[PDB]
């Protein structure tokens, strides 16, 4: 797995992570990408999408496995423990999921990155997030609960 922080002013401001099929960088924030191999790659950002085009030589291509439909409620391994929910983002503990750690992938226990967080700072006594994943049939759609800011 290659999940890389983004270098801004010599400190971490983002967190770039490569995914199956295409290499991914969260283009919501800026900062020089730490990896030198990615340091010479053109940027392809859409109006609302903040994703890097996949231009890694196909030796290390598809570092991960993408995620299909049929979301279970079960455990998804997160950087800070497992997450367990199905209707929307898991009720992450308070304090966790704040700010400054943009671009963190949530993966299945089977190695299938279910979604990519793009904010969702607080959602009450619990907290869900604003993320993007396949819609129902494999459509890269973002869902943003109200009160969502990059985390």
């Amino acid at each position: 797995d290659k999940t890389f922080p983004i270098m801004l002013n010599g400190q971490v401001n983002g967190y770039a992570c490569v995914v199956g099929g295409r290499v991914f960088k969260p283009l919501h924030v800026e900062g020089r990408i730490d990896n030198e191999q990615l340091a010479a790659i053109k940027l392809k950002k859409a109006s609302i999408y903040d994703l890097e085009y996949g231009d890694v030589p196909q030796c290390m291509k598809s570092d991960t496995l993408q995620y299909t439909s049929d979301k279970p409620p079960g455990f998804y391994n997160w950087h800070h423990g497992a997450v367990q929910y199905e209707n929307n983002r898991f009720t992450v503990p308070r304090g966790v999921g704040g700010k400054g750690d943009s671009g963190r992938p949530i993966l299945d226990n089977k190695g299938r990155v279910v979604a990519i967080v793009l904010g969702g700072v607080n959602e009450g006594s619990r907290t869900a997030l604003s993320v993007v994943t396949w819609n129902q049939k494999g459509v890269t759609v973002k869902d943003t609960p109200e009160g969502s800011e990059p985390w």
Binding site: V139, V141, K142
Partner: protein
């Protein structure tokens, strides 16, 4: 020398033909593009 109007009413059949052609072509292309814009947009509006 004698009573005539000359009120820009000399646009001939070919003249009117060409003018309506060019106006219609411009209108058609711009309206088609406008339609295509929202055609693209509604897909994304449906993706969620």
């Amino acid at each position: 020398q004698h009573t005539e109007s000359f009120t820009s009413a000399i646009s001939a059949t070919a003249w009117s033909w060409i003018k309506v052609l060019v106006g219609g072509t411009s209108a058609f292309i711009v309206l088609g593009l406008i339609a295509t814009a929202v055609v693209a947009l509604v897909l994304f509006f449906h993706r969620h």
